[PDB]
Amino acid sequence: NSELDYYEKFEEVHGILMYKDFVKYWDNVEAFQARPDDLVIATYPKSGTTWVSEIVYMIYKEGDVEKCKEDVIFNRIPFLECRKENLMNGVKQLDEMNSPRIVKTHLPPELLPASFWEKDCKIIYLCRNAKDVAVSFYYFFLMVAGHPNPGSFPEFVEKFMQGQVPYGSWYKHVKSWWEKGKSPRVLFLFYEDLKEDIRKEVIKLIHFLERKPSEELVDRIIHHTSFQEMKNNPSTNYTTLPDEIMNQKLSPFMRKGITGDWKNHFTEALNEKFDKHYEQQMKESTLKFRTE
Ligand SMILES: Nc1ncnc2c1ncn2[C@@H]1O[C@H](COP(=O)(O)O)[C@@H](OP(=O)(O)O)[C@H]1O
Ligand SMILES: CC(C)(c1cc(Br)c(O)c(Br)c1)c1cc(Br)c(O)c(Br)c1
Ligand code: NA
């Protein structure tokens, strides 16, 4: 029944488990036409996509908050592979969008449409420690339609460890993007670094995007993109979406916004099981995360 639930909700594409609604029209994603000045923001789900997106949007608008609030974020920054028959269509949104385009995606590098690589588009990749991602993704399953019942948190974590969740293995995702992140066109960031020193990462982002980093611009970005501001901003907190698709009464999208909430969810036994498995998955990579 749980396995049956997963079967009804998700289907594989290129070996990667995916929301079934997306897969039906995957040819649209496959043949997507990039432009050289497109910017890709790529993340494993729940790694702070919304956070870095708004920072990037502010950098584009030279810190003009009104310009950022002119439309909701999922319209300002289309979700590339996302498709709900005719109700939502990321590819369509991008096709009609005036450049310069900012593109959101959760795809592993092997699944990113070839055109982005061919045109050598800049990519910003953001990752977050796996435990915190797992917690966040768990509540996401609960709040959002199109997910199976995730069961108990230990049950969900078992699926997470095996990569049996939308977008597949977090382990492979981050490891693959880490290799790409050696390219000068790909900026590799950590959620935990944005928490620890937001100013340093914002400045890093400004330089990567070839803009000028003034104190005033940097200050505007920092407070506009802080958790408390974004939580209350209807342009960025997804509250304009109805409850029957995103039910924020169960759990808000802007949920806690901290590093270390895994300490509030993993039991000692689950933590031990998770840590052992994690080491085996990640031993052969120089990528290093902080869980606090
Ligand atoms: N301005 C901000 N500062 C810190 N965390 C933020 C943030 N905006 C969104 N997040 C967090 O990023 C996660 C959502 O990620 P995504 O945008 O990729 O779906 C949520 O994590 P939590 O559920 O742990 O609170 C959310 O709270
Ligand atoms: C596919 C999903 C669940 C989603 C949204 C975001 Br934001 C994500 O980052 C990831 Br991952 C998945 C979604 C939810 C609603 Br409600 C929708 O109306 C549509 Br169209 C798609
Ligand atoms: Na790089």
Residue 199: count of CB within 10 angstroms of its CB: 13
227, 238, 263, 266: residue to mutate for ligand 1 pocket, most atoms within 8 A of CB = 227
Cα(98) to ligand 1 centroid in Å equals 28
* Fold observed for domain 1-292: Rossmann fold (3.40.50)
Cβ-contact 247, 141 below 8 angstroms = no
CB 83 within 8 A of CB 246: no
Whether 88 is in the pocket of ligand 2, judged by its Cβ within 6 Å, is: yes
Residues in the chain, total: 292
Nearest CA to ligand 1 atom 1: 227
The whole-angstrom distance between residue 3's C-alpha and the CA centroid of its chain comes to 25
How far apart CA 40 and CA 31 sit, in angstroms, is 16
User: Taking the mean position of all CA atoms in its chain, how far away is CA 135?
Assistant: 14
For the chain, strand residue ranges (E) read 10-13, 16-19, 39-43, 83-84, 88-89, 102-105, 122-127, 186-190
Q: Crossing angle of helices 130-143/170-180, nearest 10°?
A: 120
Task: Kindly give the distance from the C-alpha atom of residue 121 to the centroid of ligand 3, in angstroms, as a whole number.
Answer: 12
C-alpha to C-alpha distance for 139 and 68, rounded to whole angstroms:
27
Place of tokens 């009464």: 249
Q: Which residue has the tokens 């796996």?
A: 130
**Structure resolution in Å?**
2.0
277 is catalytic: no
Q: What values do phi and psi take at 11, rounded to 5?
A: -140, 150
Please indicate whether residue 45, judged by its CB atom, sits closer than 6 Å to ligand 2: yes
Write out residues with Cβ below 6 Å of ligand 1: 43, 45-51, 132, 136, 139, 225-227, 230, 254-257, 261
Contact 201, 59 (CB under 8 A): no
The reply to whether omega before 36 is within 30° of 0 (cis) is no
> Counting beta carbons within 10 angstroms of the beta carbon of residue 99, is it exposed (0 to 12), middle (13 to 18) or buried (19 or more)?
exposed
For residue 202, give the nearest of 43, 56, 2 by alpha carbon.
56
Q: Which two tokens stand for residue 138?
A: 């768990």
What number of helices (H) and strands (E) belong to the chain? 16, 8
User: DSSP character for 264?
Assistant: G
The closest alpha carbon to 33, from 123, 115, 117, belongs to 115
Phi, psi of 98 (to 5 degrees): -65, 145
CA atoms of 198 and 74, how far apart (whole Å) = 23
Contacts of 20 (CB under 8 A, 6+ apart): 8, 9, 10, 11
- Say if CB 145 and CB 84 are below 8 A apart: no
Q: What is the DSSP string of 120-183?
A: T-EEEEEE--HHHHHHHHHHHHHHBTT-----SHHHHHHHHHTT-STT--HHHHHHHHHHHTTS
Neighbouring CB atoms inside 10 A of 212's CB total 8
Which of 173, 161, 160 has the alpha carbon at shortest distance from 15? 173
Pull the structure tokens for residue 102: 């900012």
